[PDB]
Write a protein that binds this ligand. Structure first.
Ligand code: EMU
Length: 343
């Protein structure tokens, strides 16, 4: 139990603590699990002051407790106080992961084989997620935890939602949007953060980042984000212009000079041509003409790994409450890891 950076108190089961880092309203350490005799990761979370922090916490916990897949991080144990009034911190215990794709891309240029098998694992996990009618909504390199070239896990389901192509509100900045660089164009143009297509676009961006060691659409803001995308894909066609469900949005693009489509091979000269064909289909502007997860796995680029017999799906398809009500729901969701739990 260290006190240098916010009291941990995860003992006596979890000892020999060591600081890793800190992200998203809390802190992260690795500890020794005296029950499983192996080092695990523990994230300390203190979200109860801010209602949005309570959203993501409850959101991620409900989903991860239901999900079970090699390519998706899980929750091993949750530590919290016996009473709601005493609970000010939550401790989520997960498998220790050596690094993530973000850190890896900073130090190494990936070979084609490791890019190929990384891509498979992402889509493998994503296939499960989408089969449960769930969208991750924030897929990016830092959310891809890594041990080896063969051990990739998807994490951070804080922004995850149940798929819902129907409901729409056009609430642009009223909803906590995804990481800009990996954000589908439909989200920025006509507010569409509830279809599976958005996750595929993110994976495309991740793929392009694996081929060149740098973000492909690194805009400063959302209009600049659209600038980068059209700067590579080219000016949207007449039909793609009709996908835009917004008056003022279908205007900034029309004032922009006409852009030619930059060939993928010109951007990535050293890339596998099969990779670039898949990339092309993941980064299609039109969300309806964009490749789906099962189709991507079946692309020739992944033909050496693709195996529907070894690609598990969900056995069953899977808010605006105050921070005090959400805290109760978190207190209930974590109640299964408490002594004396019934039903
Ligand atoms: C700061 C913020 C985020 C992270 C990434 N989490 C993390 N790191 C290591 N092992 C894990 N298992 C489950 N999650 C993790 C590290 C430092």
């Amino acid at each position: 139990e260290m006190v240098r950076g916010q009291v941990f108190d995860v003992g006596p089961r979890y000892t020999n603590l060591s600081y890793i880092g800190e992200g998203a309203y809390g802190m992260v350490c690795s500890a020794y699990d005296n029950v499983n005799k192996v080092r695990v990761a523990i994230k300390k979370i203190s979200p109860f002051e801010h209602q949005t922090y309570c959203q993501r916490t409850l959101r991620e916990i409900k989903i991860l407790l239901r999900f079970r897949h090699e390519n998706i991080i899980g929750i091993n144990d949750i530590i919290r106080a016996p009473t709601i009034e005493q609970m000010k911190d939550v401790y989520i215990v997960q498998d220790l992961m050596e690094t993530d794709l973000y850190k890896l891309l900073k130090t190494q240029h990936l070979s084609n084989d490791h890019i190929c098998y990384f891509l498979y694992q992402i889509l493998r996990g994503l296939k499960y997620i989408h089969s449960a009618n769930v969208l991750h909504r924030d897929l990016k390199p830092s959310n891809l935890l890594l041990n080896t070239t063969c051990d990739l896990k998807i994490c951070d389901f804080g922004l995850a939602r149940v798929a819902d192509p129907d409901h729409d509100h056009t609430g642009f900045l009223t909803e906590y949007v995804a990481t800009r660089w990996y954000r589908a164009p439909e989200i920025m143009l006509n507010s569409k953060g509830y279809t599976k297509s958005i996750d595929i676009w993110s994976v495309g961006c991740i793929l392009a980042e694996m081929l060149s060691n740098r973000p492909i659409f690194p805009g400063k803001h959302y209009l600049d984000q659209l600038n980068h995308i059209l700067g590579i894909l080219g000016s949207p066609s007449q039909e793609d212009l009709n996908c835009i469900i917004n008056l003022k949005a279908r205007n900034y693009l029309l004032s922009l000079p006409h852009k030619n489509k930059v060939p993928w091979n010109r951007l990535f000269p050293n890339a596998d041509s099969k990779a670039l064909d898949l990339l092309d289909k993941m980064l299609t502007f039109n969300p309806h003409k964009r490749i789906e997860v099962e189709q991507a796995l079946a692309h020739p680029y992944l033909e050496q790994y693709y195996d529907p017999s070894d690609e598990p799906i969900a056995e069953a398809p899977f808010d605006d409450l105050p921070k005090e009500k959400l805290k109760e729901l978190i207190f209930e969701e974590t109640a299964r890891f408490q002594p004396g739990y019934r039903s």
